[PDB]
Amino acid sequence: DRHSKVFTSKGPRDRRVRLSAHTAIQFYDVQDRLGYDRPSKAVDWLIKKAKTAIDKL
Amino acid sequence: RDRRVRLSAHTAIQFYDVQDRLGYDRPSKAVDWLIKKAKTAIDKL
DNA sequence: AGGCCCCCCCA
DNA sequence: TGGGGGGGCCTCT
């Protein structure tokens, strides 16, 4: 009934990711500063901010 | 206790790619990586 | 890690 | 109505 997976280069993967307790603290801190309703918008932002780090592989 | 984030299909795909390109086992460690590599932008918010 | 169920809110 | 989010819990590898 609910879209729960996504197909990736290394198989099926879930759209609901678990976070370590420490990492949740940091990420939720980021979501608070960005003010985004839904978390995906925060993750998008991080990815865009880390563009050059990602681009250097 | 079991903290999780629900991603959109579009965002999941972009994120898992970053995780694969980083070669990390756990997604949580990829989220640590993005946060550290964006502190300068985060701190400026 | 995947899966289920629930409940709340929005569109 | 449909679809989103998180909490809470279970069961497997």
Swiss-Prot record, chain B:
Annotated TCP domain ranges read 1-45
**Tissue-wise, where is it found?**
Mostly detected in lateral organs, such as leaves and flowers. Expressed in cotyledons, particularly in the vascular region, in leaves, roots, stems, buds, flowers and immature siliques.
From the Swiss-Prot or TrEMBL record, state where the protein is found.
Nucleus
Its quaternary structure? Interacts with AHP1, AHP2 and AHP3. Interacts with SPL.
What is the role of this chain? Plays a pivotal role in the control of morphogenesis of shoot organs by negatively regulating the expression of boundary-specific genes such as CUC genes, probably through the induction of miRNA (e.g. miR164). Participates in ovule development.
Q: What is this protein called?
A: Transcription factor TCP10
Question: Gene name, please?
Answer: TCP10
